[PDB]
Amino acid sequence: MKSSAKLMYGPTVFMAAMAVIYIFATMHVSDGGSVKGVEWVGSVALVLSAGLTLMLGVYLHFTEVRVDVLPEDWEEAEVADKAGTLGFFSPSSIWPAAMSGAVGFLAFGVVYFHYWMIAVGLMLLIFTITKLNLQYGVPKEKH
């Protein structure tokens, strides 16, 4: 995954440049349609955005440096090079809808700010995420 990891440095350099430019400009430049002073929202936003693209670019690069030459990253790969297992995928699950319902109960409790609704929604949410994450591991019944 070379090109994917490497193309995250375009926007990283650009957003860092725009961050420093915006910062110096908003603190030093004066025009009649704004008040001079560093604008903190855009400052923090742009530097953290460059942080996000830095994060992905660096992690994906640090992975790329020790993955083998895969057939999907090769220009003349034969279709039989990926023959074998591809991986495990969930065939079905009721718990995504369950989680959406838990989050719905939580959000309506937050709306009305009923304390019992917030408590029950948080309980439902931890339960449904737990049951999602225990789906393919529940024991066989021992009776």
């Binding site: 992975t63 020790r66 993955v67 990926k82 297992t85 991986g87 495990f88 995928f89 393919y136």
Partner: protein, 57 residues
């Protein structure tokens, strides 16, 4: 000597680890049923006993 789980694959010790945080030996998620397993098996060795049910008509 240190402990290894009985469900853990055996491996070439020069090849590092079965899995680590950056890399795996599979493109998707590893299976809960152990990747060393090969499916299907015989129905006899799943242990499912298919019932025989007759209801009164």
């Amino acid at each position: 000597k240190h402990f290894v789980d009985p469900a853990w694959p055996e491996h070439n010790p020069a090849d590092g680890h079965v899995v680590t945080e950056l890399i795996s030996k599979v493109a998707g998620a590893s299976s809960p049923w152990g990747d060393d397993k090969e499916f299907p098996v015989s129905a006899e060795e799943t242990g499912y006993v298919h019932p025989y049910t007759r209801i009164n008509r």
